[PDB]
Ligand binder design. Structure first.
Ligand code: DGD
Ligand code: DGD
Ligand code: CLA
Ligand code: CLA
Ligand code: CLA
Ligand code: CLA
Ligand code: CLA
Ligand code: SQD
Ligand code: BCR
Ligand code: BCR
Ligand code: LMT
Ligand code: OEX
Ligand code: CA
Ligand code: CL
Ligand code: CL
Ligand code: FE2
Lengths: 97, 137, 36, 37, 243, 30, 333, 30, 450
């Protein structure tokens, strides 16, 4: 019954897409027009029940909504894992260049 | 292997036009890069923000695209964030902020073109070593 | 801790004073050839 | 840079700081001339 | 007021601001206006660890411990929203601040107990029908105790949760089951209970102070052993500001 | 038993230091 | 006079071990450091050297042996702060934060400096020439470099050398990772000093043993051919000089014994002086030669050298050392 | 260019030994 | 002449020891050597100016003398920006000309002037064992040093001031009008511990204390000079010291070694009289700057820096010092005693204030933090910037590193020289510096130790 939760999360869609509830913010660099404004809003307003709920962040302009709709296919939502979101690891997980 | 004009051919604008730098242009671009940018951009990475680098793909995914000479010169004139929403000339060297960043004071248009050409040519020479950090040292 | 502090200060002061006044007590004269 | 009227003396300035080291070397040269007596 | 040059090196920076004995008033709580706890300081004064009895039937009473991590224990600059419920009970919801301190205490015999003294995500409610903060107002609440090490921590053999090996590579041909508890690192999130007892109110400034007792769990070494139950007692200072 | 062995060897070394200093062969002029 | 009698006893050349005033300082500090070292090496609890609440066990009772045991340096949270016993609330806090290391190293440095002074003092009392203490200043400078000067430059006594064998190896490897000491010319001079010291030690011993004058038989040891305090020379320096001058060439051989022994004194002492200065100058982060990506071909491709392989090894040590202590990309100290 | 610096340093580094040589030639107090 | 081993007893490699009892030639040696020192000062200043790029920071250009002139308030403006390079030129040129004069005097007294000054004059001729004359010369030189300290005071108070890195609004050239003449404040620096958080006289952090201490030092040196001109050494002083030229040299060598170590620590730690605008950041400054920089970056990204937990359980950005102060987290917890003008506006009574950190970090502080992070005093011997594992792109080694390393080497070698000359002076005064007399060997007259 002892399982590494990070490996199991790598077995889910967290290992293929950007998890809005769990992924570190720097991964939002790998898609156009997300880092840092939209990425900060997404990480701040997490968790989300579904991916489309990211279109309900209060304060988004129409351009930001269009960018989010364009990048919606790269987004997944898994359950919040404590190990990835504790200690402020969504903003700084210790992985620099 | 030599520094052929095929290596020194880099996209000039976002339309698709290119430019063939001379060897002297590349050498002066490398020297000016060491003079003004290398203290934080040594090897194609960013010391004060390692999430961003100077790889051509990362510059291409920036808004506006920075994987060409004109985009890089525009960044050296009016630097922005990665999404382009916010101007960061007060914390990044530029022609606007030459008063607070005095190493940008005597940088001409040709100097900015040379630095941009060095930035766009170094990945073509070095591989993933450019912007890859200590893993590829 | 306070008693230990004063105790150590007293011991160190005693040994340092021994050193200083010993080297002031005609140390160059304590040689086997030219005591002067 | 130096003031412009001194510009042609720029190479000489470029070799001025190493003059003291030569002085040390000069001592040995002198001691070689007298045969290290 | 003292500046940094007067405070530094004295241990006063680890101590909550105290109130005078001539503060027994009542800060009026007006339900219409929003209230904010602008500062919430927690200075622990004693740590007790529940001794583990070899016999299960035993009483298992709390034993005092000796602090070995020096003046690094206080939580301070904690802010939050002090909302007024329909019951009339006040409720503090903690937004941010320095809400955690790693604390190691030494038991008799040399056993070191590390814990994350914390009030992370504290929700603390008062008694019903409170119209003013008095010396009888009492906050009782719950908070989250995250794992003492986070996911990037590596053990002496290089094993961790989000980084590192998953096996004892210095024993390449050892049976893995008996090492399982040391090979798989687990991130523990637990619950803690805190009781703040207001003993001094300055109504004009809005400043309350008193004692607190909290109960939580110690470090489990990323799931390598059982945590201890820790009771932390100390004093607290808080500033209530209208909006 | 390993700690006792290390401390025992160390103590024998210090005892040997004592005997080699204070109970040495006295050097004699010849 | 009591003070005069005490001065006569302290400076007496008839004591079995000479005391002197440098000794009246040396003996208590060295005794304190030795007793604290033995007690800590046997029975000290684990010490949080990195300041990150991950204590390192260094004593024999807590699972170490002779090789792996150490007196662990004081906490990085302490830094360069002075941490005596009376600054701790309790002895348990003092032992947790690495106070024994500070006590031992401060007493040892004071005692070893006074050991140098005591060497001068006894040389003066015996009518000798005084420069044995100058020779001892090289290992003393080395001890000061690794115990005091490197912590001062790095800003924490946690970066000082641990008082143990494996801790010393850890100090060496981390030092190579952060400073490239092998590529530093002062350390190369030190290696030349110690290699040459061993070489010239074996050379001088073998040449003197080779030229020993026959005063015994094959039954007895040759060492019985020498008597303590004899005026005559026990070996033939002319024969040894002839041998060594035929071995290399004549003018490479010392015929002056005083010049030869000055050379024997001077070579390792100067080499160790330079390596102690190397440790101090790398304590102020003036590191060894950096030749990474120095060789570049016509196109601009990096042509690796042996320095780049050294750089790969240094990168491995750098990314693995103090694996939990860094939060930021640059290991600035 | 660099030739100017080399000429200057050559003249200074010969000016030293020229003093020594002139003193030896005329049998000075050298 | 005493210019050979047979006449003097010293070989060529100890040939300057032939100058001990030759006052005129020894004076020539000293004056020529002083000319060498002034020559290096002037020529190095002109060399540094000739390659000086005034728009680039001084610490990036391998300069150690121009920062000294800039610290005196010459040629610089607000923020350390160079406004005029002519004062640097004047200092260099005047030193070069004065060095020519001193070299003329040294050469004259060394090879042409009288070999001994005792016949020509009784004022200038000296005997090493004449204690009164030695104290008289010491008094003259003490008066000269006191006048130099008062010259620094005069520059600070009446001739434009000094560069104050702690000046309000930013570092600027400021005239010190109110020097700290309080002996409790001034001599409280001498009683301060040399260890962490106290730092002894290296911890002086304001120019008022610097000017007041120099007023005290100048007055004390002048008073002691008059004292030694008017008095003779007392009996305890006469019995406690060796009175010979090599002994006085050894005393000065020990003093210079101590001063070299003090200067090493001063240039490594102090950023007041060695402003980071000119000399670059200190090691503590650079580590604190890195922590500050990434705090700013992650706070802009949305991190709650007060509650972020690092891998070990300590605060990733903010933690507590052993006495409770709110400090930067990570390894830079060792550098929590650092004080700098760019960091002080965020420090409250309990350390770094979370509210000011969230709301008051200005862009000039961010620029300063990034600049000091990327110009840490770390570099290779062949001037490659960064850690030992960095690649060859940045040509940078901090002036603080150069000065600290060079003066530690010099201070250690001068401690060695002090030991050498102190032992030799003792042996020569006692009469066995040339070896053991065979007929009167002391150990043969001693009882055995068994
Ligand atoms: C160990 C260190 C112990 C501490 C002592 C440190 C200070 C010693 C002073 C040396 C005086 C001569 C130095 C010199 O002139 O040093 C300068 C030259 C190198 O020249 C220049 O060296 C420069 C390095 O300085 C500066 O480079 C940059 C300037 O653009 C930066 O400002 C950087 O921080 C700064 O250090 C650059 O690399 C230039 O490209 C290069 O032209 O050293 C050389 O080659 C040196 C000459 C080689 C002879 C070998 C020595 C003989 C054996 C005894
Ligand atoms: C044989 C060979 C023998 C060789 C032996 C070498 C012995 C000499 C070594 C150092 C002597 C001088 C120490 C000194 O001047 O001591 C002073 C220095 C300075 O100490 C540092 O001083 C700093 C002062 O700066 C402060 O104030 C400054 C003002 O500008 C800045 O603002 C700065 O940021 C701020 O922190 C801080 O207080 C640091 O915490 C503190 O460590 O001490 C240190 O490094 C020294 C640490 C203790 C040394 C104890 C040994 C002596 C007894
Ligand atoms: C700072 C360095 C320094 C200085 C100032 C001196 C100075 C001196 N040394 Mg000396 N020495 C030095 C380094 C130095 N030495 C070193 C490194 C060694 C080891 C090799 C020696 C070995 C040595 C020996 C063995 C002896 C001396 C002696 C002397 C003294 C007499 C010199 C003499 O008659 O020479 C005469 C030599 C000449 C006339 C040749 C020309 C030299 C001139 C001065 C060169 C000037 C060059 C300069 C560019 C001129 C500028 C002029 C301009 C300013 C107008 C003199 C005071 C002698 C002594 O003790 O006297 C009793 C002696 O016997 N020295
Ligand atoms: C102000 C400082 C000072 C002064 C005035 C003296 C004065 C003296 N020393 Mg002394 N010494 C000093 C500092 C000083 N020392 C220091 C710091 C040390 C420790 C290294 C020594 C170690 C020392 C020894 C071991 C001896 C003396 C001796 C002497 C006497 C004769 C010196 C002579 O002729 O040199 C002649 C000069 C040389 C032979 C040149 C030496 C070259 C040096 C070692 C290399 C310099 C390298 C350079 C800095 C960088 C490289 C340059 C490049 C060209 C490669 C003389 C009274 C001798 C003595 O006791 O006489 C009574 C003696 O045997 N000294
Ligand atoms: C306090 C002394 C000191 C300090 C801190 C510096 C510092 C600096 N100098 Mg400088 N310099 C000095 C003295 C000093 N210098 C002297 C005396 C001269 C006259 C020769 C010069 C001439 C000079 C020039 C011409 C240049 C510099 C440059 C530089 C910069 C880079 C140096 C470099 O690359 O190192 C190179 C490192 C070395 C050469 C290593 C030297 C190691 C020595 C040999 C060790 C000696 C040990 C010991 C003393 C010997 C004793 C032996 C024992 C047995 C007794 C740096 C800021 C350069 C620069 O950037 O200028 C703008 C430059 O071009 N300097
Ligand atoms: C420490 C330095 C020093 C010392 C102690 C001496 C000492 C001496 N010199 Mg000498 N000299 C020196 C430097 C020094 N000189 C220099 C630098 C030069 C080159 C210009 C000379 C050139 C020189 C010559 C040509 C002659 C002497 C002579 C003499 C002797 C008698 C001088 C006399 O009666 O003065 C009386 C007093 C005065 C004339 C007043 C001088 C006032 C000065 C200019 C004030 C300067 C201000 C301040 C104190 C100096 C600061 C300088 C500093 C910043 C570097 C005497 C032994 C004579 C000698 O030996 O005859 C046998 C002789 O003929 N000297
Ligand atoms: C370059 C500076 C200098 C030098 C070389 C001398 C040299 C001398 N002075 Mg002197 N003096 C000076 C400046 C100087 N003075 C100044 C500026 C003043 C005015 C304040 C005086 C006032 C003065 C008086 C009033 C007396 C002397 C005396 C003496 C003689 C004996 C020195 C002695 O035994 O002290 C060695 C030091 C001691 C014996 C003190 C005890 C040593 C302690 C334990 C050391 C503690 C310091 C330690 C290293 C830590 C450092 C930091 C600490 C300061 C906090 C000697 C010739 C004496 C004499 O014979 O008068 C004619 C005497 O009575 N001096
Ligand atoms: C938890 C901590 C507990 C620690 C407790 C330690 C208490 C110490 C007190 C012990 C009683 C004294 C016994 C001395 C034995 C002795 O040395 O006899 C030898 C003689 C005896 O004194 C000689 O004695 C003679 C009289 S007689 O021989 O005894 O009759 C007398 O004539 C002569 O002047 C005199 O020199 O000693 C001497 O020669 C002079 C003193 C030199 C000895 C100092 C010891 C050095 C300490 C070590 C420092 C570095 C080493 C670090 C560790 C490796
Ligand atoms: C005794 C002796 C010795 C020594 C000597 C000496 C040490 C000397 C010194 C000397 C010196 C110390 C010198 C100096 C000189 C200088 C000069 C002569 C200068 C001049 C100058 C000029 C000419 C200037 C110019 C200019 C200007 C004006 C500006 C611009 C730049 C220029 C540079 C151009 C010896 C060791 C050898 C040994 C033997 C003996
Ligand atoms: C605050 C200030 C300052 C000031 C300072 C001062 C005021 C100083 C002084 C100081 C001093 C005032 C010092 C002194 C010192 C001393 C010493 C260093 C001593 C020595 C001694 C000796 C050496 C002795 C010895 C001996 C012995 C031990 C015994 C017997 C014998 C004999 C005698 C040998 C300044 C400017 C920086 C500026 C900033 C601030
Ligand atoms: C304005 C004036 C200020 C003056 C301040 C002076 C400060 C320093 C004073 C140092 C005094 C030391 O005094 C010193 O003490 C010893 C102890 O009695 C004296 O006595 C000593 O004499 C001889 C040799 O001298 C020794 O063998 C003997 O054992 C001892 O009694 C010394 O002869 C004396 O020099
Ligand atoms: O503590 Mn011992 O080693 Ca000198 O670097 Mn930073 O700190 Mn830590 O890391 Mn790498
Ligand atoms: Ca109450
Ligand atoms: Cl390690
Ligand atoms: Cl860190
Ligand atoms: Fe021998």
């Amino acid at each position: 019954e002892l399982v590494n939760v990070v490996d199991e999360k790598l077995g889910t869609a967290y290992g293929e897409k950007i998890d809005l509830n769990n992924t570190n913010i720097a991964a939002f660099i790998q898609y156009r027009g997300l880092y840092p404004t939209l990425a900060k809003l997404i990480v701040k307003n997490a968790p989300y029940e579904s991916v489309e709920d990211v279109l309900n962040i209060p304060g988004l302009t129409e351009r930001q909504k269009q960018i989010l709709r364009e990048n919606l296919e790269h987004f997944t939502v898994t359950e919040v894992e404590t190990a990835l979101v504790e200690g402020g690891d969504r903003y700084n997980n210790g992985l620099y260049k | 292997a030599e520094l052929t004009p095929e290596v020194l051919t880099v996209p000039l604008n976002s339309e698709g036009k290119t430019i063939t730098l001379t060897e002297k242009q590349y050498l002066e671009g490398k020297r000016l890069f060491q003079y003004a940018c290398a203290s934080c951009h040594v090897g194609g990475i960013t010391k004060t923000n390692p999430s961003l680098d100077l790889r051509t793909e990362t510059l291409a995914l920036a808004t506006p695209p920075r994987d060409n000479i004109e985009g890089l010169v525009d960044y050296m004139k009016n630097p922005t964030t990665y999404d382009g929403e916010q101007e960061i000339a007060e914390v990044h060297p530029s022609l606007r902020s030459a008063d607070i960043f005095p190493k940008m004071r005597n940088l001409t248009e040709k100097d900015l073109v040379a630095i941009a050409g060095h930035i766009l040519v170094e990945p073509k020479i070095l591989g993933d070593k450019w912007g890859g950090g200590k893993v590829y040292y | 801790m306070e008693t230990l502090k004063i105790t150590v200060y007293i011991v160190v002061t005693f040994f340092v004073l021994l050193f200083v006044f010993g080297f002031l007590s005609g140390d160059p004269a304590r040689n086997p050839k030219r005591k002067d | 840079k130096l003031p412009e009227a001194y510009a042609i003396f720029d190479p000489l300035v470029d070799v001025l700081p190493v003059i003291p080291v030569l002085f040390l070397a000069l001592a040995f040269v002198w001691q070689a001339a007298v045969g290290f007596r | 007021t003292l500046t940094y040059d007067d405070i530094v090196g004295t241990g006063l920076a680890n101590k909550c601001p105290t109130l005078d004995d001539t503060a027994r008033g009542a800060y009026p709580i007006d339900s219409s206006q929003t209230y904010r706890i602008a500062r919430l300081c927690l200075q622990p004064t004693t740590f007790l660890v529940k001794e583990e009895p070899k016999n299960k039937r035993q009483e298992a009473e709390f034993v005092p411990t000796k602090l070995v991590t020096r003046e690094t224990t206080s939580l301070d600059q904690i802010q939050g929203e002090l909302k007024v419920n329909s019951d009339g009970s006040l409720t503090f919801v903690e937004e941010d601040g320095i809400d955690f301190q790693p604390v190691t205490v030494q038991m008799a015999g040399g056993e070191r107990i590390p814990l994350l003294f914390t009030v992370k995500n504290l929700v603390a409610s008062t008694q019903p029908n409170v119209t003013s903060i008095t010396t009888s107002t009492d906050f009782k609440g719950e908070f989250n105790v995250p794992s003492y090490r986070t996911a990037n921590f590596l053990d002496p053999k290089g094993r961790g949760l989000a980084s590192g090996y998953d096996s004892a590579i210095a024993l390449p041909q050892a049976k893995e089951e008996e090492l399982a508890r040391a090979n798989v690192k687990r991130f523990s999130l637990t619950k803690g209970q805190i009781s703040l007892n207001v003993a001094k109110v300055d109504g004009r400034t809005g400043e309350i102070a008193g004692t607190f007792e909290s109960e939580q769990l110690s470090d489990d070494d990323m799931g390598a052993h059982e945590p201890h139950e820790v009771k932390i007692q100390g004093v607290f200072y808080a500033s209530i500001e209208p909006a | 038993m390993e700690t006792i062995t290390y401390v025992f060897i160390f103590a024998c070394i210090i005892a040997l230091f004592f005997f080699a200093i204070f109970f040495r062969e006295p050097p004699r002029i010849t | 006079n009591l003070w005069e009698r005490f001065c006569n006893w302290v400076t007496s050349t008839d004591n079995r071990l000479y005391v002197g005033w440098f000794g009246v300082i040396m003996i208590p500090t060295l005794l304190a450091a030795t007793i604290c070292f033995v007690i800590a090496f046997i029975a000290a609890p684990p010490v949080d050297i990195d300041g990150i609440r991950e204590p390192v066990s260094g004593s024999l009772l807590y699972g170490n042996n002779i090789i792996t045991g150490a007196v662990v340096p004081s906490s990085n949270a302490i830094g360069l702060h002075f941490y005596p016993i009376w600054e701790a609330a309790s002895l348990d806090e003092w032992l947790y934060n690495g106070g024994p290391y500070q006590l031992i190293i401060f007493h040892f440095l004071l005692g070893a400096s006074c050991y140098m002074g005591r060497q001068w003092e006894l040389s003066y009392r015996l009518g000798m020439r005084p420069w044995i203490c100058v020779a001892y200043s090289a290992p003393l400078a080395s001890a000061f470099a690794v115990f005091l000067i490197y912590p001062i430059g790095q800003g924490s006594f946690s970066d000082g050398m641990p008082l143990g064998i494996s801790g010393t190896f850890n100090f060496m490897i981390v030092f190579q990772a952060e400073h490239n000491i092998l590529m530093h010319p002062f350390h190369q001079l030190g290696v030349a000093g110690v290699f040459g010291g061993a070489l010239f030690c074996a050379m001088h011993g073998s040449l003197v043993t080779s030229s020993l004058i026959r005063e015994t038989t094959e039954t007895e040891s040759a060492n019985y051919g020498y008597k303590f305090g004899q005026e005559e020379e026990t070996y033939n320096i002319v024969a040894a000089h002839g041998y060594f001058g035929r071995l290399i060439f004549q003018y490479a051989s010392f015929n002056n014994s005083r010049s030869l022994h000055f050379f024997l004194a001077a070579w390792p002492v100067v080499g160790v002086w330079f390596t102690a200065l190397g440790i101090s100058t790398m304590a102020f982060n003036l590191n060894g030669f950096n030749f990474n990506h120095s060789v570049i071909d016509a196109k601009g491709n990096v042509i690796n050298t042996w320095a780049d392989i050294i750089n790969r090894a240094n990168l491995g040590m750098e990314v693995m050392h103090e694996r939990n202590a860094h939060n930021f990309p640059l290991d600035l100290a | 260019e660099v030739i100017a610096q080399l000429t200057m340093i050559a003249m200074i580094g010969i000016a030293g030994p020229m003093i020594i040589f002139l003193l030896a030639v005329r049998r000075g107090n050298l | 002449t005493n210019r050979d081993q047979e006449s003097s007893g010293f070989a060529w490699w100890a040939g300057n020891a032939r100058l001990i009892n030759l006052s005129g030639k020894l004076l020539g040696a000293h004056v020529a050597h002083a000319g060498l020192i002034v020559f290096w000062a002037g020529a190095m200043t002109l060399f540094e100016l000739a390659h000086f790029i005034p728009e680039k920071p001084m610490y990036e250009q391998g300069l150690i003398l121009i920062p000294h002139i800039a610290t005196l308030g010459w040629g610089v403006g607000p923020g350390g920006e160079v406004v005029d390079t002519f004062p640097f030129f004047v200092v260099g040129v005047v030193h070069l000309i004065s060095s020519a004069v001193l070299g003329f005097g040294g050469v004259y007294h060394a090879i042409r002037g009288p070999e001994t000054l005792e016949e020509y004059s009784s004022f200038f001729g000296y005997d090493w064992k004449d204690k009164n004359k030695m104290t008289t010369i010491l008094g003259f030189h003490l008066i000269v040093l006191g006048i130099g300290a008062l010259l620094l005071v005069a520059k600070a108070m009446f001739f434009g001031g000094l560069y104050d890195t702690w000046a309000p609004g930013g570092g600027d050239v400021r005239v010190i009008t109110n020097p700290t003449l309080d002996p409790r404040v001034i001599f409280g620096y001498l009683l301060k511990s040399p260890f962490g958080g106290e730092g002894w006289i290296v911890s002086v952090n304001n120019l008022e204390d610097v000017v007041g201490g120099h007023i005290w030092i100048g007055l004390i040196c002048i008073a002691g000079g008059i004292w030694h001109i008017l008095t003779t050494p007392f009996g305890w002083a006469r019995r406690a010291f060796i009175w010979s030229g090599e002994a006085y040299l050894s005393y000065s060598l020990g003093a210079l070694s101590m001063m070299g170590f003090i200067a090493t620590c001063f240039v490594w730690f102090n950023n007041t009289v060695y402003p980071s605008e000119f000399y670059g950041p200190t090691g503590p400054e650079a580590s604190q700057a890195q922590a500050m920089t990434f705090l700013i970056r992650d706070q802009k990204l949305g991190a709650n820096v007060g509650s972020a937990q690092g891998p070990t359980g300590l605060g990733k950005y903010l933690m507590r010092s052993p006495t409770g102060e709110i400090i930067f987290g990570g390894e830079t917890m060792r550098f929590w005693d650092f004080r700098g003008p760019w960091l002080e506006p965020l420090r409250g009574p309990n350390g770094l204030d979370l509210n000011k950190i969230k709301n008051d970090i200005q862009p000039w502080q961010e620029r300063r933090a990034a600049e000091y992070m990327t110009h840490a005093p770390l570099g290779s011997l062949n001037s490659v910037g960064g850690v030992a594992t960095e690649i060859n792109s940045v040509n940078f080694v901090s002036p603080r590193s150069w000065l600290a390393t060079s003066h530690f080497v010099l201070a250690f070698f001068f401690l060695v020289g002090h030991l050498w000359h102190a032992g030799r002076a003792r042996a020569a005064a006692a009469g066995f510096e040339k070896g053991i007399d065979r007929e009167s060997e002391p150990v043969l007259s001693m009882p055995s130790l068994d």
